């Protein structure tokens, strides 16, 4: 009888950066997936290993939403088997991702005259991501053969990077806000369900 | 729920080029990817590839790509499935399927259009 | 890519009788995640696009009368029906949606025996 709580997710004042992207779990609780899937507000709502319209009939032991905001050409790099520096530096999700990627363009809410430079991603790692891998540090990244020991200059690059969401910039590099869910069943009471689950 | 409906019977020659179309109306038609099935006559099923409107992700059965283009017009719901130069051997029904993911079964299908290609 | 292969290629069962119906994968199906195999069972009547008959190895699509029944695990898996009524004379196909491409079994013609 407990709502769960999407619309904290979806209509939050401010999203996350992406190489700090945020992640809340959500159980124990009734879900009406419609509320989703019968909106015209999302530019994007990609969805694999399971379908939405039967998501009011299942239970799930865990839903985890993850969200965040990137640029409008990084939005198809939220998806398994892709390859980039979002992918691989700062949000990654496994082969047998199961839920849905849901997105749109936040122009009026996220970029500014004079810029919003307040949303950044990560340029530089040393290795790829694991699945569901949040990476927050800032070392210098050594570019070239010359140590850095944390000083930036040449061939040493301070890892993180702003977006500069102007409204003029064309849509490719227009802020779009990006929802992640992840559905889960793992040996455990399966408590977050639709109204008919 | 959806529904899928297909452009009418084709008849042509060798060589001439062709495009048909696949339309979805319904609820939640932003959560569908529409795939192109091939049945040549009393033959079975042959899937040759499938795309996301919402952004135009296509992906092409080995068997099949390079040889057609799997296409969307997001304004008007619609899906495109388009030889350049027909051979007779593309005589077959074409059926386009709707699955609300990738990885999702087909659960809404068109009813089908008859390609007939001959001199 | 995962190929599929149904046996028998035809099968005659009397009215009321059970018909049996396999499907053989190169490689499992099974999503981790949820624990689900993604292999779905369609029926075609001549002249008809294919129907839905079941999705997730073993759940009915809705509105799927109870004669039909999916079953099966790893890489065996079996479409019944539990007695033929003369609207199942059709073809039966199994389909892997576990990833791209998708591909089918070759079908299985089921007939009233005489």
């Known amino acids: 009888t407990n709502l769960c709580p999407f619309g904290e997710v979806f209509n939050a004042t401010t999203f996350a950066s992406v190489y700090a992207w945020n992640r809340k779990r959500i159980s124990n609780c009734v879900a009406d997936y419609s509320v989703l899937y019968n909106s015209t507000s999302f530019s994007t709502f990609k969805c694999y290993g399971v379908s939405p319209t039967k998501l009011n009939d299942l239970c799930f032991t865990n839903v985890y939403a993850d969200s965040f905001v990137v640029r409008g050409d990084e939005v198809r790099q939220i998806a398994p088997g892709q390859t980039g520096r979002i992918a691989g530096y700062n949000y990654k999700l496994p082969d047998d991702f199961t839920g849905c990627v849901i997105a749109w363009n936040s122009n009026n809410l996220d970029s500014k005259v004079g810029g919003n430079y307040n949303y950044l991603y990560r340029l530089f790692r040393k290795s790829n991501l694991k699945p569901f891998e949040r990476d927050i540090s800032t070392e210098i990244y050594q570019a070239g053969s010359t140590p850095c020991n944390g000083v930036e200059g040449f061939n040493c690059y301070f890892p993180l990077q702003s977006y500069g969401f102007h409204p003029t910039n064309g849509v490719g590099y227009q802020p779009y806000r990006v929802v992640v869910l992840s559905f889960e069943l793992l040996n455990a009471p399966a408590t977050v369900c639709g109204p008919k689950g | 729920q959806m529904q899928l409906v297909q452009s009418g019977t084709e008849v042509k020659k060798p060589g001439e080029s062709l495009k048909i179309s696949c339309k979805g109306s319904?609820?939640?038609?932003?959560?569908?990817?529409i795939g192109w099935v091939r049945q040549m006559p009393g033959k079975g099923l042959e899937w040759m590839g499938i795309?996301?409107?919402?952004?135009?992700?296509?992906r092409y059965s080995p068997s099949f790509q390079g040889q057609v283009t799997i296409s969307a017009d997001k304004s008007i719901n619609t899906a495109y499935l388009q030889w350049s130069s027909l051979k007779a051997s593309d005589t077959a029904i074409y059926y386009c399927?709707?699955?609300?993911?990738?990885?999702?079964?087909?659960?809404?299908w068109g009813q089908g259009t008859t390609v007939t290609v001959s001199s | 890519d995962i190929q599929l292969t149904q046996s028998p290629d035809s099968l005659a069962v009397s009215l009321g009788e059970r018909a049996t119906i396999n499907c053989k994968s190169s490689q499992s199906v099974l999503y981790s995640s949820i624990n689900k195999n993604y292999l779905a069972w369609y029926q075609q009547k001549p002249g008809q696009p294919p129907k839905l008959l079941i999705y997730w190895a073993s759940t009915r699509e809705s509105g799927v009368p109870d004669r039909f029944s999916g079953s099966g695990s790893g890489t065996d898996f079996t479409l019944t029906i539990s007695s033929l009524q003369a609207e199942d004379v059709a073809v039966y196909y199994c389909?892997?949606?576990?990833?791209?491409?998708?591909?089918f079994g070759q079908g299985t013609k089921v007939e009233i025996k005489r």
């Open positions: 795309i996301y409107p919402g952004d135009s992700e296509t």
């Open positions: 399927a709707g699955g609300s993911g990738i990885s999702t079964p087909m659960d809404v």
């Open positions: 319904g609820y939640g038609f932003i959560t569908y990817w």
């Open positions: 389909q892997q949606y576990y990833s791209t491409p998708y591909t």
